[PDB]
């Protein structure tokens, strides 16, 4: 979830 960004599903 995100990582090295801000997205999920």
Request: net charge positive.
């Amino acid at each position: 979830c995100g990582g090295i960004r801000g997205e999920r599903a």
